[PDB]
Amino acid sequence: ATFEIVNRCSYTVWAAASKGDAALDAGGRQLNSGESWTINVEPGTKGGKIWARTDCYFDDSGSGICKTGDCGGLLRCKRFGRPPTTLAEFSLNQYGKDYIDISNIKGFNVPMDFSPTTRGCRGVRCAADIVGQCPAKLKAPGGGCNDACTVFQTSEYCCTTGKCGPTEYSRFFKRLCPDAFSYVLDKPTTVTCPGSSNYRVTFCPTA
């Protein structure tokens, strides 16, 4: 499957793509404002994620740091990124269908649209100014808006027991972005697409 990753933000981002135990495609790349990078994701990929990283430095070997979404200091991510990270999430070719969503469960750094480029389903979007509106206790000093699990490490926020409800913090994310997961047991906002659809992830779709 192809995923065109487009940076419409006015700032550089370092796109990342992983299924947690491996890179997807090259795993990461710099995208200056306006640039597009198309990756190939193997059919059947389960639990894949795409995200943006901000304020990165990498040396000539691809090692460094980012302020949001850092994946073990690598340009080419093999693992998931450090919160806060707005997440484009997908599982492909699952009994004949693809499943896509956006999640704020690991916080928010960059606004995103995640849409099919082929027929048969809608896209999802979380493009509100969550960083600007972020509750004071969730603001990440390194940049972005942390989820409450990251900040407070409680069973209720982290849904450790499979028993949690919505919270004042989850409701903030849900108010700003109804179409994204705000906590682990949120009413799902997953979209079912035809198996083997192709996609576009756009950072800063509205500015």
Within 10 angstroms of residue 137's Cβ, the number of other Cβ atoms is 11
How far from 56 is each of 14, 62, 111, CA to CA, in Å? 7, 11, 18
Residue 27, Ramachandran bin (φ over 0: left; ψ between -120 and 50: alpha; else beta): left
Resolution in A, one decimal?
Answer: 1.0
Task: Give all strands (DSSP E) within 57-157, no chain letters.
Answer: 57-58, 64-65, 87-94, 97-103, 112-116, 124-126
Helix, strand, coil share of the chain (percent; to 5):
10, 35, 50
In contact, 81 and 74? CB cutoff 8 Å = no
Structure tokens at 140: 């990440």
Transcribe 15-47 into DSSP letters. EEEE-SSSEEEEEEEEE-TT-EEEEE--TT--S
Pairing of strands 199-203, 112-116: antiparallel
User: Among residues 141, 110, 133, 116, which one has the least CA distance to residue 205?
Assistant: 110
Residue 110 and residue 106: Cα distance in Å, rounded? 12
Structure tokens at 64: 């460094």
What technique solved it?
X-ray
Q: Which domain holds residue 188?
A: 1-207
In contact, 164 and 186? CB cutoff 8 Å = no
Helix, strand, or coil here: 82? coil
Structure tokens at 136: 């004071």
Structure tokens at 58: 């990498």
Give the total number of structural domains in the chain. Answer: 1
Q: Which ranges constitute the DSSP H helices of 119-205?
A: 130-133, 148-152, 155-158, 168-176
CA angle 127, 148, 132 (to 5 degrees): 35
Residue 131 CA, chain-centre distance (Å), reads 14
**For residue 202, which phi and psi values (nearest 5 degrees)?**
-115, 120
Q: What CATH number does residue 173 fall under? A: 2.60.110.10
How far from each other are the two terminal CA atoms of the chain, in whole angstroms? 27
User: Among residues 75, 77, 74, which one has the least CA distance to residue 48?
Assistant: 77
